[PDB]
């Protein structure tokens, strides 16, 4: 289908990204604790539920959590501050906690069941979040003798995510620490945050400054 764009809530960040995050693509956001990557994930889980006129895609969300960072109270707060019903917004976020890298991989495969069920409805899955992509892979595969299998397993996981994104017109959004759009977050001045786009093949490298508010991400 046509490439849909989900607003991040920030006009500055959306301009940097070419209008927002894309369906049929993996957007990978990097940053240290406090850089705003989890705030962006929570904001996008709300924004995607809005109609296109308001920066969303009238969509449902699937969220894979590798380390206990999903906060339903933060969704409710962002939803209510954006004029949405907080309970309805939460009902349209399917949640899974992944306990290890094998289970994380299995969940991406299992997500296809619900994606297929909602595909021709009024609320198709339009956003699949994996927070935080490599935490289990880094913990489970230590050192020299483990790199080949860690890379093999991560490549398969990413291929599985790209397949769902392309086949079902979903924006895949992943968070991490240091063929996919890579955005680097950092602390800016006066409690603001900065996003830097690096090595995008068809978007200029640039920076966007944004704030974290009761609405989640905004300028
Ligand atoms: N069966 C499921 C699989 C998932 C896979 C990825 C993200 C969320 C998911 C939620 C469920 C659920 O039963 O609520």
Residue numbers in the entry: 108 to 285, 309 to 349
Question: What do the authors say?
Answer:
BRCA2 acts during HDR to control the recombination enzyme, RAD51, a eukaryal protein evolutionarily conserved as RecA in eubacteria, and RADA in archaea. RAD51 executes the DNA strand exchange reactions that lead to HDR by assembling, in a sequential and highly regulated manner, as helical nucleoprotein filaments on single-stranded (ss) or double-stranded (ds) DNA substrates. Structure-based approaches to identify modulators of the BRCA2–RAD51 interaction have been impeded by the lack of a monomeric unliganded form of HsRAD51. We have previously described the development of molecular surrogate systems for RAD51 based on an archaeal ortholog, RadA from Pyrococcus furiosus (Moschetti et al., 2016). In brief, we were able to produce the C-terminal ATPase domain of RadA as a stable monomeric protein, and by careful mutagenesis, to convert the surface of the protein to resemble human RAD51, with the ability to bind the BRCA2 BRC4 repeat with high affinity.
Investigation of the structure-activity relationships (SAR) around these hits showed that naphthyl derivatives, particularly when substituted with polar groups, were able to bind to the Phe pocket with reasonable activity and ligand efficiency. For example, 2-naphthol bound to the HumRadA2 protein with a Kd of 460 μM as measured by ITC (Scott et al., 2013), whereas 3-amino-2-naphthoic acid bound with a Kd of 1.3 mM. Crystallographic analysis of these fragments shows that the naphthyl rings bind in the same orientation as the aromatic side chain of phenylalanine in the FxxA motif of oligomerization peptide or BRC repeats (Scott et al., 2016).
